[PDB]
Amino acid sequence: ETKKPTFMDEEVQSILTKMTGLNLQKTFKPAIQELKPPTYKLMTQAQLEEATRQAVEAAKVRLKMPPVLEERVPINDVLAEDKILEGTETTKYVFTDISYSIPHRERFIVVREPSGTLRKASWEERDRMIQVYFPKEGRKILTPIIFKEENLRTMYSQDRHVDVLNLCFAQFEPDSTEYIKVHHKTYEDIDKRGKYDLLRSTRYFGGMVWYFVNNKKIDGLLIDQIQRDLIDDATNLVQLYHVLHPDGQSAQGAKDQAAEGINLIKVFAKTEAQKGAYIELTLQTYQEALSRHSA
């Protein structure tokens, strides 16, 4: 009938791509790593504009958003219960199929328990075993201690939210419970302290917006976009909200009033926004400065 959009829909990806932004100085910030002497090229204005164009293409690749997946369902499947083996072993065996040309989500990884039960490895056992035999750079077999609540607050205090997300992406699968818990705790710390600019021009801004829109808490991000003269992004945020909440007070108000542009933010501020007063004030201020520039 009428399906609500997904994170990977072309319409949503286009909206989130623009709201993210592209900043070549931030996207290609100098990395603190082993250095080599730089190279130099003599370029005309056309060769320079082409070199900058290629950098923009390489940046749009580096800003490719990770897919937002739902939590994976725990694996609890028994293949066999050979009770004659009960009490013959004290430690369980983990068998991993290490055939090279198999996707890691299709590899049979089974566990022979001391009870004699042959079962499929759990999601946590699977990712641990895949790291043992197919080690991925940046991933650890044992969970790093940085992901404890006490150590994440330290990273948040230093405004290292992007490092937290880079570490989580490297350690956990996108559908893991640890991956989703860490991302959500990071998105929430950003909303509470208004640190939305830390994720702009990164591949993590869209996932953050997706989280706020689905949880109906876009008031903080909407205010941040107006204070930064990003009304185009603020208006797209309100439209994405209506698209994902069609049967809502704000979405109907926009239909009844045929609102467009800045009017959408006014409709949303009155009906569904929790900080409706702070938005009208923040929006009023913007219209004033825009009139001063016009005059």
Partner: protein
């Protein structure tokens, strides 16, 4: 007060004289610099070593070179020159590389203000030839602004740590050419076998890349 003085060589010179036989004098080589590109050197000659020190260091401050530095830490480009029989090959290096050079070059580089450079001295290792050979090469280095003005093109710096981002370091003050620089499929530049042998993993030396104190 802003200038520091460093000794590079103290020699005892013996002069045979008509009536007094072998006499002993002192020849001193000293370098001066303020650490901000202004540096010089001078020879001093006196019977007493302390007098030779005073003559050299006071004279050197009146023969100052200005040395251009890239980002105030290294040279603008690789410099390879010969002065008499002393060869000096210098390489531009990134920050954190330090001064991996002949100890005399290290001393002079601290006076100039160069923090990161590799240098190799070959042939005769004559301190005077090395000192004046080093200053000759450092004073004749073309900066990026000079390169842009000479060729009327942008000088674009590509750093691997910054990915494909093009960093314009210098733009011509005059008009900007519209014709790309000709792309000679193969450059006819002369190469150093030592540099190539190293890049190909064929350079084996127990003394290269040894751990040393911070310089």
């Amino acid at each position: 007060e802003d200038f520091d003085t460093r000794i590079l060589e103290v020699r005892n010179v013996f002069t045979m004289t008509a009536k007094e036989g072998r006499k002993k004098s002192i020849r001193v080589l000293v370098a001066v610099g303020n650490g901000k590109g202004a540096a010089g050197f001078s020879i001093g000659k006196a019977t007493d070593r302390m007098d030779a020190f005073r003559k050299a260091k006071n004279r050197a401050v009146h023969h100052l070179h200005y040395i251009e530095r890239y980002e105030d830490h290294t040279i603008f480009h690789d410099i390879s020159l010969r002065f008499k029989r002393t060869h000096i090959k210098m390489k531009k290096q990134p920050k954190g590389y330090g001064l991996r050079c002949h100890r005399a070059i290290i001393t002079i580089c601290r006076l100039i203000g160069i923090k990161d450079m590799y240098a190799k001295v070959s042939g005769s290792i004559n301190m005077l030839s090395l000192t004046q050979g080093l200053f000759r090469g450092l004073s004749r280095q073309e900066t990026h602004q000079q390169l842009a003005d000479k060729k009327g093109l942008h000088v674009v710096e590509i750093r691997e740590e910054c990915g494909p981002l093009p960093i314009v370091v210098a733009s011509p003050r005059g008009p900007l050419r519209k014709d790309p620089e000709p792309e000679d499929e193969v450059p006819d530049v002369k190469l150093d076998w030592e540099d190539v042998k190293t890049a190909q993993g064929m350079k084996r030396s127990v003394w290269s890349n040894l751990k040393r104190a911070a310089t």
